[PDB]
Every structure is written in structure tokens, then in C-alpha cells.
Design an enzyme around this catalytic site. Structure first.
Site, PDB file in Angstrom:
ATOM      1  N   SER A 142       5.981   4.742   0.582  1.00 27.51           N
ATOM      2  CA  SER A 142       6.709   5.851   1.254  1.00 27.51           C
ATOM      3  C   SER A 142       7.169   5.186   2.702  1.00 27.51           C
ATOM      4  CB  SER A 142       5.819   7.042   1.502  1.00 27.51           C
ATOM      5  OG  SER A 142       6.580   7.944   2.062  1.00 27.51           O
TER       6      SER A 142
ATOM      7  N   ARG B 243      -2.480   1.130  -6.451  1.00 28.06           N
ATOM      8  CA  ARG B 243      -1.470   1.730  -7.373  1.00 28.06           C
ATOM      9  C   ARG B 243      -0.471   0.397  -7.798  1.00 28.06           C
ATOM     10  NH1 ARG B 243       0.838   7.483  -5.724  1.00 28.06           N
ATOM     11  NH2 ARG B 243      -1.104   8.611  -5.184  1.00 28.06           N
TER      12      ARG B 243
ATOM     13  N   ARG C 299      -8.897   9.499   2.385  1.00 31.69           N
ATOM     14  CA  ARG C 299      -8.537  10.664   2.604  1.00 31.69           C
ATOM     15  C   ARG C 299      -9.212  11.778   1.769  1.00 31.69           C
ATOM     16  NH1 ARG C 299      -1.840   9.405   2.029  1.00 31.69           N
ATOM     17  NH2 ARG C 299      -2.174   7.693   3.439  1.00 31.69           N
TER      18      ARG C 299
ATOM     19  N   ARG D   2      -4.959   8.269  -7.527  1.00 32.61           N
ATOM     20  CA  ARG D   2      -5.617   9.287  -6.237  1.00 32.61           C
ATOM     21  C   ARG D   2      -7.139   8.958  -5.716  1.00 32.61           C
ATOM     22  NH1 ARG D   2      -5.524  15.860  -6.531  1.00 32.61           N
ATOM     23  NH2 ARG D   2      -5.611  16.447  -4.188  1.00 32.61           N
TER      24      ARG D   2
ATOM     25  N   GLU E  13       4.845   6.982  -7.422  1.00 36.29           N
ATOM     26  CA  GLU E  13       4.790   6.512  -6.084  1.00 36.29           C
ATOM     27  C   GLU E  13       3.846   5.457  -5.685  1.00 36.29           C
ATOM     28  OE1 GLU E  13       4.521   9.880  -3.069  1.00 36.29           O
ATOM     29  OE2 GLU E  13       4.199   8.387  -1.600  1.00 36.29           O
TER      30      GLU E  13
HETATM   31  N1  LIG Z   1      -5.413   9.064  -2.420  1.00 33.84           N
HETATM   32  C1  LIG Z   1      -4.358   7.919  -2.722  1.00 33.84           C
HETATM   33  N2  LIG Z   1      -5.122   7.022  -3.501  1.00 33.84           N
HETATM   34  C2  LIG Z   1      -4.386   6.132  -3.798  1.00 33.84           C
HETATM   35  N3  LIG Z   1      -3.367   5.670  -3.197  1.00 33.84           N
HETATM   36  C3  LIG Z   1      -2.677   6.628  -2.620  1.00 33.84           C
HETATM   37  C4  LIG Z   1      -3.607   7.884  -2.057  1.00 33.84           C
HETATM   38  N4  LIG Z   1      -2.494   8.524  -1.033  1.00 33.84           N
HETATM   39  C5  LIG Z   1      -1.640   7.704  -1.251  1.00 33.84           C
HETATM   40  N5  LIG Z   1      -1.354   6.407  -1.849  1.00 33.84           N
HETATM   41  C6  LIG Z   1      -0.581   5.435  -1.892  1.00 33.84           C
HETATM   42  O1  LIG Z   1      -0.363   5.156  -0.401  1.00 33.84           O
HETATM   43  C7  LIG Z   1       1.193   5.365  -0.190  1.00 33.84           C
HETATM   44  C8  LIG Z   1       1.552   5.523   1.284  1.00 33.84           C
HETATM   45  O2  LIG Z   1       0.761   6.961   1.655  1.00 33.84           O
HETATM   46  S1  LIG Z   1       1.814   7.865   2.089  1.00 33.84           S
HETATM   47  O3  LIG Z   1       0.951   8.845   2.741  1.00 33.84           O
HETATM   48  O4  LIG Z   1       2.866   8.336   1.445  1.00 33.84           O
HETATM   49  N6  LIG Z   1       2.347   7.141   3.835  1.00 33.84           N
HETATM   50  C9  LIG Z   1       1.587   6.371   4.554  1.00 33.84           C
HETATM   51  O5  LIG Z   1       0.478   6.293   4.319  1.00 33.84           O
HETATM   52  C10 LIG Z   1       2.362   5.709   5.533  1.00 33.84           C
HETATM   53  N7  LIG Z   1       1.560   5.291   6.243  1.00 33.84           N
HETATM   54  C11 LIG Z   1       3.342   4.671   4.789  1.00 33.84           C
HETATM   55  O6  LIG Z   1       2.441   3.706   4.075  1.00 33.84           O
HETATM   56  C12 LIG Z   1       1.518   6.112  -1.061  1.00 33.84           C
HETATM   57  O7  LIG Z   1       2.956   5.766  -1.515  1.00 33.84           O
HETATM   58  C13 LIG Z   1       0.885   5.892  -2.453  1.00 33.84           C
HETATM   59  O8  LIG Z   1       1.158   4.609  -3.089  1.00 33.84           O
HETATM   60 CA   LIG Z   2       4.879  10.719   0.188  1.00 34.83          CA
END
Ligand SMILES: Nc1ncnc2c1ncn2[C@@H]1O[C@H](COS(=O)(=O)NC(=O)[C@@H](N)CO)[C@@H](O)[C@H]1O
Ligand SMILES: [Ca+2]
Ligand SMILES: Nc1ncnc2c1ncn2[C@@H]1O[C@H](COS(=O)(=O)NC(=O)[C@@H](N)CO)[C@@H](O)[C@H]1O
Ligand SMILES: [Ca+2]
Ligand SMILES: [Ca+2]
Ligand SMILES: [Ca+2]
Ligand SMILES: [Ca+2]
Ligand SMILES: [Ca+2]
Lengths: 428, 428
Positions: B356, B395, B266, B281, B353
Site C-alpha cells: 500500500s 506476503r 496488529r 493475515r 495486496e
Molecule cells: N496482519 C497482516 N499480516 C500480514 N501482512 C499484512 C497484514 N496487514 C497488512 N499486511 C501487509 O502489509 C502491507 C502494508 O500494510 S498497510 O496497512 O496497508 N499500510 C502500511 O502499513 C503503510 N505503512 C505502508 O506499508 C499490506 O499491503 C499487506 O501486504
Molecule cells: Ca490497505
């Protein structure tokens, strides 16, 4: 990168060694650039000294009119900047040559032109005699519904795969077994690494400047505009070896033995139509890598040790293979000496490469400025680096599926993998 | 993508539902484009019919002078191409609006503006009371020498990590435990997927056209110039959900329950200075994903089931958490209903979080043309898709390290993970 003092003192001797790899060293161009460099270096350093001196004359006179002196220093500063830019252009030209030179092959390496000149060193196991017509891993994957190349073309494009169900579980079990073997039995420390790396990292292990075309590159992120020109790793060798970049290691802490399980990304340019079908040649494959950072005098012994570690993976899995000493003309850019392990692939009626184990000597260590020092001797030296597949996971899956296939297409799970599959004996 | 017939018949009703998410639907623009579209559609289809007819007149006269007739057809063909291009420009304009519209929130979703309007549904476990000052996972990682952010900046840049030794082993153990739980106990089928995907895949799950900036994009390969504009996956939801793209599934084969363990990439644009320190993050994180492809009438029940699967990961690991019903203003683009699980993070004195879980209804199914049919009823319908983290591995490591830390910094290994760590009780 080769020793610059070795290219300056004896370029004909170096050119002779490199000729065995089929590389022509442009000795005349290097000599002409080096002679012009010495002229520009003297001019530049004289301008640097006179500018530094006229700047001190200003500060002196500031305590005791500094206008004619300020004009003199600004003209000298322009002249110096011009001389430095001209010198830097010549330095970049030398670098473009120097950084494209492959490693000098070690004398242990047999002379050859290509892979057909490689020497078999040993052989282990006896290829299975089948009571039915051998199916390849692609046909077996379709039968189980476990290897889906068509879904991967839909998701992405060619040279990608989607594995499903028990065959995906099997591919994971293979990676788990490999990491546990190297960490529990072979003294490697496990690592989780970035799968995207910067330009310094790629120059460090030799992918840059010469093999940019072998990589997937990512466009810079707009909020990291000048610091996110990255490339996906083609092997965990790239981030792992760079962990010692700009470091002085206490020799007591050597050898540093690192392992990682990563996806590997390769553009797979050239050799059009080679290994079109199946998992042998993909844009994305998993590989359990072994990397060793050692003292210069221990690298030849470390190559034998690390090759044996990769061989143990094949032996425990009961996969027949051959160990091959690569000739001068078939070695990779960074390697000074390489052994390939080639696994038996029943549908191809041949051995296919599953591992490449190399002694890189001080070639990447020079680029990375990775050194060691004994507190006793109180003298630094560049380390030697080594890397070896233990193993390429996709090609191990190919070998496993094909060597362990049953008459009805079921896959017998190798004994050593059964604890990784909850004691499962067969898939299907 | 929302139902085009629902945007045409009742746009004011749709606009009202979308207003709860804080999205203003441009009803007037959509109506004006739709009215012009009908004018161009009639003109275009009349030109198509007359060109097809004058072309048949040629073939007729060819058997029985076809020069004035050939000129007429070539002028008609130019006129039609012009009318089709003008119509296609209007269709692209409608699409630019239609494909940027978020999913209609389900009536179960509480109305809210942002995360502060989210509703707590349940809570499990009691946050640990410490007999010493809590250390965060970054300090604990430095103590063990196991989380190295500085080496990752050297290798790549910010928001990357290098994990070393036993903490890397622990992060792997977490992923193994998650995949085994979902595959052995929860009825998910394991998958190995591409980590690079094409534009059709990104449009399919909604990352395109609206969130290109959230992704790392790779430059095309020169030998695949027009077919390798790829992006790294931000979640295994993207390749897994697209496995049913352009498919008609027999309803007897539903639910299709898929799991994968992948790195996730990301750009992490915006929210500058948020979660600067540590693993919360990152640009690259591992996540064990759950995806369900279900019959339209079973998706609400499948959301409860899949959320419970993610909750079981937290319960078995002994990690206190809270289950939160996201409000209309805090939901993702594709979701019609979401639950977040928030794990207790002792150094932050809050829940963060970790998962999700979403019901996407038929939103991605419409984009992908993923449908199901009963052989009995003999009628097709779009499937419903669902996705949930089971869990984000980085996480989970943060939560594990912080909740299980000892006075001297040792990490107690959760009981359920000990078989994954050869029965090891503590790290350090
Ligand atoms: N940049 C990041 N770095 C680390 N963990 C992250 C990051 N972005 C999201 N997450 C974790 O990834 C989980 C799922 O990301 S989400 O965007 O919410 N949802 C999805 O990607 C869905 N496909 C369900 O997994 C979040 O709840 C969080 O725990
Ligand atoms: Ca979310
Ligand atoms: N494109 C590919 N697809 C699948 N497997 C591949 C591909 N390219 C290489 N491999 C496997 O990966 C192994 C190691 O690759 S290598 O380039 O030879 N050497 C390295 O990468 C070193 N870092 C040692 O692992 C090869 O022996 C082969 O088994
Ligand atoms: Ca030691
Ligand atoms: Ca090498
Ligand atoms: Ca090779
Ligand atoms: Ca069924
Ligand atoms: Ca979603």
C-alpha cells in the site's frame, strides 16, 4: 524445575548445593506441605473411589427407585469437590516454592558470591594501543549522525535507540554474518519465531513465575480476551527452547541445533544508574541466539562446542575478548554451568559481557516435558537444553565501532564483514 | 488532523469532501462547540489579565499592607483555574471530534464505497500456467517442514508462525534484497528503530485516538510507571515518520527518504474468519517500509516514484501483479491518495495486496508539527509525508513459494535472490 523425587528423598543434599548460589531452600516448609499433601491425597482418592462407586450403583438400579441414591452421590460430589479444591490450594503452595528454586549448580562451577569471584579461563587477542584519545561508541555515533538516542526518547523513551544510515547497515551486516556463520559452518538450523509468547512458554524456560518483572507484558486483545496474556521475548532462547515442549524426540534426531536473530525486550529493573549511556543496556536489542537440545550425556561437550561457536564470531571479527567461568553466585536462574565471553571495550578500559553460554541440564526440559527415547533401549529420559549468545548484536556494534575507530572518527569495517557491506572499507 | 482554519472558515466544503469516504462530519456540533469556545476564551483571557495585574499590584505595594490584596489574588486565581478547567474540557471535546476525522481525499482519487469500486491502473507479468494442481504456501511449508503454525500456537496463539530451516533463510533473503534495493538503487537511508512507541508517536501518525484497538499495548514498567504506556508498532511508518516530529527542516535537505525492516504487530480485530489459513493475515509480520518527507509541491511526484520502487521489487522477483488506485471508500485514515499493488497468488486464483503506497499530504505533518523552510523565501510550511510497503515480507514469501513451486513441491529460488542464498537454485 528440580526433580520432585530428589526434593522428597534428599532435600538436605539439594539445600546444600543451592546454598552455594546463595539460595536458602525452605526444607522445613516443603516437608510440612508434603506431609499434609499425603493426608489430603489419601482423603481425596478415597472420596473419588466412593463417588465413582455410588455413581455405578445408580446405573445398576436404573435398569432394575434411584432418588435416595441420587442425593447420596450429589452430597459425595460436593464433599469431593471441596476436598479437591483444598488439595489443589496446597499443590499451588508447593508449586510457588518449587518453581522459584534456581537450578542446582554443576560441580564444574567454582564457588563464589558474585561476579568478582568469577574465574578467567582464557584470553584471545591484544587490546589495541591508540595514537589518539579513544572515543566511545556514543560520541562516534553522534559524529557519523548514526546513533540517535534523543530521537528514540522522542519516539518512545529511555533505553531505546534509532540508528541511521551506514551504522544501521553495519548493525544489520553483523546479524547477517552471525546467522550465516552458525547456519553454514556450525550446523545450526535457522528459525523465524514469534516475538510475543504465552505464559506456558515463559514457565517452560523459567521466566515465570519468579521474573515477570523483567518483561514487557501486553494487555489481552479484546477478541482474544482469555488467550492473549502475552510477554515480549527477552531472548530467542524462550521461543526456541519451547519448540520441544511436550515432545518425545527420537535420540537419532539429537542434537537439535537452532539459531534465530530477534529483537529482545527487557524491563531492565534494578541496578539504577548502571550503563545509562549507550547501547550496553537497552530495553530493545538484537541478538543472534544459539540453542541446542541434546542427549543428557552430551550436554557438557555441547557447552564447549557452543561456546567455541560464539568465540569464533569474536575471532573472525578481530575483537579481543576473555572467556570467564561464572561462579555459583553469578549464574542465571536456569543455568547449571555458564561461560561468559567479555569483549574488549576501549573507552571503558575493560572487557564487557557480549555472550552468555549455558548448560541448563534437564531444568527447562522438566518444566516443558521435553524428552528423548532410543528406539533400541525403548526408554524415555528428559533432554538437556543449552543456550548461548552468538552474539548480542548491539554490544558487538559497540565493540566493533570502538576497536576499529580511526583518528578522525571513521569506522574501519572488519575484513570478514566487508562482503556484507559490498566491499566497503570504512564508514565515513 | 485537518487544517483548523479550514474547519472554521468552510466546514460545509470539508464535510462534502469527507462524505465521499463515507464519513459524516458533525458540522453542527463543531460549530456549537466553536461558538462556546470563543465565549470561554474571552472570559478566561480577561481573568488571566486581571490576575496578572492584581499580582503586580502586590509587588508594587510590597515596597511601599498586602493582606486584602493577597486574598483578592487568591480568589481571582481560584476563579481563573475553574475557568481554565472548564475551557480545557471544551477543548478536549473539540479534539475528540477533530482527531477522529480522516484525511480529505485528493481529487485524483476515484469516488467509491469499498474495494469493489477500486480502479485497476496497470498490470505486469503473466500468471503461470501449471502442469499440476497448485499447492498453497501452507501445504508447501508442511512438505518442507518449513512453516509451522502448530508450534506457534503452542508458543503463543493463533495468527503466529514459526519458520524453520531453508524457508526461514528465504524469508530473511527477501528482506535483505529489499533493503539493499532501496538503499543502493532508490536513494533511501537505512534505519534501525524502536518496535515500541509512546502515545505522542501514535497520535503523530494517526493510530491514536481512533485505532487503539488495532494495536498490542504493553503495561507500564513499574520503575517507569508514568512514562512507559507503549504500543508495539503496526508498521515502521509509525517510528520513521515521527523522526521529523517538532522539526523545521531546511528545504535543501528534502526529500528525506527512509527505509527500515521491522516486525509489525496488529490485533487484526474484526473481519472474523477472513484469511484464517496461512501468512496473509498475521499478528506479527515483517515488512520493509519506505517513508518520504517531502516539500508540499513534490508529494504527488514522490507517490509515483515510491510506488515504482515497490513495483521494482515485484518485477525483479518475477512476480505478476496489478497496480490499483484505491477509491475514496477503501482508503486508510491518513491517506489522501493510495495505490495498492496486488501480487498474483496461484492457490487463491487472484491478486492479493502486497503493498500500500500513500500520499498523506500534510495530515501527519500537522499532528507532528513537522515543517520545512527555505533559507531564501524565509517562510515555514508543513511538509508532506508518504509511506509505502517495499514490501510486506510474509506476503512476498507466500507469492514466491506459490509462483515458483515445482511438481514435487521444491521451491525454485528467483534469480535475483540466488546471490542472497549462496547461489542456491532450489529449496529441496
Ligand atoms: N496482519 C497482516 N499480516 C500480514 N501482512 C499484512 C497484514 N496487514 C497488512 N499486511 C501487509 O502489509 C502491507 C502494508 O500494510 S498497510 O496497512 O496497508 N499500510 C502500511 O502499513 C503503510 N505503512 C505502508 O506499508 C499490506 O499491503 C499487506 O501486504
Ligand atoms: Ca490497505
Ligand atoms: N538490556 C540489554 N541490552 C543490551 N544487550 C544486553 C542486554 N541484556 C543482555 N544483553 C546481552 O545479551 C547477552 C545474552 O543475555 S543473557 O541474559 O546473558 N543470556 C541469554 O539471554 C541467553 N539466552 C544466551 O544468549 C548478554 O551477554 C549481553 O551481551
Ligand atoms: Ca541423526
Ligand atoms: Ca539459561
Ligand atoms: Ca549473564
Ligand atoms: Ca540537498
Ligand atoms: Ca498512511
Amino acid at each position: 524445575m528440580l526433580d520432585p523425587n530428589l526434593l522428597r528423598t534428599e532435600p538436605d543434599a539439594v539445600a546444600e548445593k543451592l546454598a552455594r548460589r546463595g539460595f536458602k531452600l525452605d526444607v522445613d516448609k516443603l516437608r510440612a506441605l508434603e506431609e499434609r499433601r499425603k493426608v489430603l491425597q489419601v482423603q481425596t482418592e478415597n472420596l473419588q473411589a466412593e463417588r465413582n462407586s455410588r455413581s455405578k450403583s445408580i446405573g445398576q438400579a436404573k435398569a432394575r427407585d434411584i432418588e435416595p441414591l441420587r442425593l447420596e452421590v450429589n452430597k459425595l460430589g460436593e464433599q469431593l469437590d471441596a476436598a479437591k479444591s483444598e488439595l489443589e490450594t496446597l499443590l499451588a503452595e508447593i508449586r510457588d516454592i518449587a518453581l522459584a528454586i534456581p537450578n542446582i549448580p554443576h560441580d564444574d562451577v567454582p564457588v563464589g558470591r558474585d561476579e568478582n569471584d568469577n574465574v578467567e579461563v582464557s584470553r584471545w587477542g591484544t587490546p589495541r594501543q591508540f595514537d589518539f584519545e579513544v572515543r566511545d561508541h556514543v560520541t562516534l555515533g553522534e559524529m557519523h549522525g548514526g546513533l540517535d538516542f534523543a530521537a528514540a526518547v522522542k519516539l518512545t523513551g529511555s533505553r531505546f535507540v534509532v540508528m541511521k544510515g551506514q551504522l544501521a547497515r553495519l548493525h544489520r551486516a553483523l546479524a547477517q554474518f552471525m546467522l550465516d556463520l552458525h547456519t553454514e559452518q556450525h550446523g545450526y538450523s535457522e528459525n523465524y519465531v514469534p516475538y510475543l509468547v504465552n505464559q506456558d512458554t515463559l514457565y517452560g524456560t523459567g521466566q515465570l513465575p519468579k521474573f515477570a518483572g523483567d518483561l514487557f507484558h501486553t494487555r489481552p486483545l479484546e477478541e482474544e480476551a482469555d488467550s492473549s496474556n502475552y510477554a515480549l521475548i527477552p531472548t530467542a532462547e524462550v521461543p526456541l527452547t519451547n519448540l520441544v515442549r511436550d515432545e518425545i524426540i527420537d535420540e537419532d534426531d539429537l542434537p537439535i541445533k537452532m539459531t534465530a536473530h530477534t529483537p529482545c525486550f527487557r524491563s531492565e529493573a534494578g541496578s539504577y544508574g548502571r550503563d545509562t549511556r549507550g547501547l550496553i543496556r537497552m530495553h530493545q536489542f538484537d541478538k543472534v541466539e544459539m540453542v541446542q537440545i541434546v542427549r543428557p550425556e552430551d550436554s557438557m561437550a555441547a557447552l564447549e562446542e557452543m561456546t567455541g561457536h560464539a568465540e569464533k564470531v569474536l575471532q573472525l571479527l578481530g575483537l579481543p575478548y576473555r572467556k570467564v567461568a561464572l561462579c555459583t553466585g553469578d549464574m542465571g536462574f536456569s543455568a547449571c554451568k555458564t561461560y561468559d565471553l567479555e569483549v574488549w571495550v576501549p573507552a571503558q578500559n575493560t572487557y564487557r559481557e557480549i555472550s552468555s553460554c549455558s548448560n541448563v541440564w534437564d531444568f527447562q526440559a522438566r518444566r516443558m516435558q521435553a524428552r528423548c527415547r532410543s528406539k533400541s533401549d525403548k526408554k524415555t529420559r528428559l533432554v538437556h537444553t543449552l543456550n548461548g549468545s552468538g552474539l548480542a548484536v548491539g554490544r558487538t556494534l559497540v565493540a566493533l565501532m570502538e576497536n576499529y575507530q580511526q583518528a578522525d572518527g571513521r569506522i574501519e569495517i572488519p575484513e570478514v564483514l566487508r562482503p556484507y557491506m559490498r566491499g566497503l572499507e570504512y564508514i565515513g
